[PDB]
Design a protein around this ligand. Structure first.
Ligand SMILES: Nc1ncnc2c1ncn2[C@@H]1O[C@H](COP(=O)(O)OP(=O)(O)O)[C@@H](O)[C@H]1O
Ligand SMILES: [Mg+2]
Length: 399
C-alpha cells in the first residue's frame, strides 16, 4: 500500500538519476508518498534541488502537474536543461525567463493557457508578475528553491498557496483566524497539492510557517493536539449517588465508559431505575448512537477498549482505563473537546477512582504527556465548568 509506492519511487530515482537516494532524499520521498508538504532544512549539497526535479518527473508519470520555482535565471535554465535530457519525450516540460527567445516564450505561454503541460519551471519574478494567471491553476506539486527570496512579498505566499489548490477565501479566513490568535483547521474535504520549500537558514519569522501548517497537510508537529480545552476532575469513590449528582447538572451530552460490559450493564440498570434518559452501546449501537446524536437520549454508556463534539460535552470514566492506558484516556477525554465552527469548544472529563496508586499513575503520566492536570472534586467549580461548556458551544453555533 504505502511501502510499495515509496519503492516504486526509490527504483525510479535510482534508474533516471544514476545513483541512490541520500539519507535526506529518502526521508523526503516517504513524505511525498504520504502526500505530505514540508520544509527542506539541510546544508547546501545534500540533494534538495535534484530531488524536487526528480519528484516532478515521477509525478508526471501519473500525469500529475508540477511547478518548479527558483530565485535566479541560471537555476531556471540549469533545471530546464537537466529536465529535458532526463525526460521521456512524452513529458511536456516548459520553462520561462525574461531573457528567453521570443519563440520559446510563446511556446511556454501557449502551453500555459491550454494547460497542455506536465512540468513548468520559472523564477520568483514570474510569480510576481503572473499572480492572476497562476492563481487559476491547480498544481499537484510546487517546489520552491529558496523561499526567503519569495517570502518577501505576502502577495507571493498567497499565489503559491493558490497554485496548490487553496482558494483565496480560505487563505483569507485562515490568516484572519491566526490574526485573532485562534486555531484554524483546514477543511478536510479539500485535497490541495504538495508544497515543498527549501529554507537556507530555517528563517525565524512566525507567520509563514503558521499559515503553512494550517493550510497544508504538513509534517506533524506535536504528539498531543493543541485542540484540547478540557478540565479533568477526580472523584475518589465509585458512588452512584455522587454520579447521579453530576448527571443532574451535566444533564445532556454525557458519555460513560465502564471497565467491563457487566459493570456497564449494572450502571445502565441503576440509571434506568432512577428514570434517566439513558442508552447503551452493546445491545443496539446504531439505534442508541443516533438517538444520542439526535437528542432523544442524554446519556450513552459504553465500554473501554472500544458521536460529535457538538454532542459530547461530558466524559465520565467509571474506573480509570486499566494500565493506566493513558493513550485511551487521552483519546476518549479528547472527545469532549474539538474545534467546532472555528471555536475550540470546552469539555469536561471526570474519573471515578478509589485506588490512589492507579490514579497517581494516570495523573503523573497525563501531566507528562498532555501537560494537563487532574484536580480533585473539591477544587471543581461545577458552575463555571458547565457554563464554559454551554457558552463555548453557544459561540460555535453562531457560525
Ligand atoms: N541521490 C544522490 N546521490 C549522489 N549524488 C547526488 C544525489 N542527488 C544529487 N546529487 C548530486 O549532488 C549535487 C548537488 O545536489 P543538489 O541537488 O544541488 O543539492 P542542494 O539542492 O542541497 O544544493 C548535484 O550536482 C547532483 O548531481
Ligand atoms: Mg540547490
Amino acid at each position: 500500500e504505502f511501502w510499495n509506492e515509496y519503492e516504486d519511487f526509490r527504483s525510479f530515482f535510482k534508474k533516471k538519476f544514476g545513483k541512490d537516494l541520500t539519507g535526506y532524499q529518502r526521508l523526503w520521498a516517504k513524505r511525498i508518498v504520504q502526500g505530505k508538504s514540508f520544509t527542506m532544512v539541510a546544508p547546501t549539497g545534500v540533494g534538495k534541488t535534484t530531488f524536487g526535479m526528480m519528484t516532478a518527473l515521477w509525478l508526471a508519470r501519473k500525469g500529475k502537474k508540477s511547478a518548479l520555482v527558483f530565485p535566479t535565471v541560471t537555476l531556471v535554465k540549469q533545471t530546464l536543461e537537466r529536465l529535458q535530457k532526463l525526460a521521456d519525450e512524452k513529458v511536456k516540460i516548459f520553462g520561462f525567463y525574461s531573457s528567453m527567445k521570443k519563440e520559446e516564450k510563446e511556446k511556454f505561454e501557449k502551453s500555459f493557457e491550454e494547460d497542455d503541460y506536465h512540468i513548468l519551471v520559472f523564477s520568483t519574478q514570474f510569480v510576481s508578475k503572473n499572480r492572476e494567471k497562476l492563481s487559476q491553476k491547480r498544481f499537484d506539486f510546487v517546489f520552491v528553491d529558496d523561499v526567503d527570496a519569495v517570502l518577501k512579498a505576502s502577495r507571493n505566499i498567497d499565489t503559491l498557496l493558490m497554485m496548490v489548490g487553496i482558494p483565496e477565501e480560505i487563505i483569507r479566513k485562515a490568516f484572519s483566524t491566526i490574526k485573532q490568535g485562534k486555531i484554524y483547521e483546514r477543511p478536510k474535504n479539500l485535497k490541495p497539492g504538495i508544497l515543498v520549500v527549501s529554507s537556507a537558514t530555517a528563517k525565524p519569522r512566525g507567520i509563514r510557517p503558521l499559515l503553512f501548517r494550517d493550510l497544508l497537510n504538513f509534517t506533524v508537529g506535536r504528539l498531543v493536539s493543541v485542540a484540547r480545552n478540557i478540565t479533568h476532575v477526580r472523584i475518589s469513590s465509585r458512588s452512584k449517588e455522587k454520579l447521579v449528582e453530576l448527571l443532574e447538572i451535566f444533564r445532556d451530552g454525557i458519555l460513560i465508559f465502564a471497565q467491563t460490559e457487566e459493570e456497564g450493564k449494572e450502571l445502565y440498570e441503576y440509571l434506568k431505575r432512577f428514570k434517566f434518559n439513558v442508552g447503551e452501546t452493546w445491545s443496539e449501537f446504531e439505534k442508541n448512537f443516533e438517538d444520542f446524536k439526535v437528542g432523544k437520549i442524554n446519556i450513552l454508556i459504553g465500554v473501554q477498549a472500544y458521536d460529535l463534539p457538538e454532542r459530547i460535552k461530558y466524559v465520565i470514566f467509571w474506573g480509570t482505563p486499566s494500565g493506566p492506558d493513558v493513550y485511551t484516556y487521552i483519546q476518549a477525554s479528547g472527545r469532549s473537546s474539538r474545534i467546532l465552527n472555528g471555536v475550540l469548544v470546552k469539555g469536561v472529563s471526570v474519573i471515578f477512582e478509589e485506588d490512589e496508586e492507579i490514579f497517581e499513575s494516570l495523573k503523573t503520566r497525563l501531566l507528562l504527556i498532555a501537560e494537563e492536570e487532574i484536580i480533585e472534586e473539591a477544587e471543581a467549580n461545577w458552575k463555571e465548568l458547565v457554563h464554559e461548556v454551554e457558552e463555548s458551544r453557544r459561540r460555535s453555533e453562531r457560525e
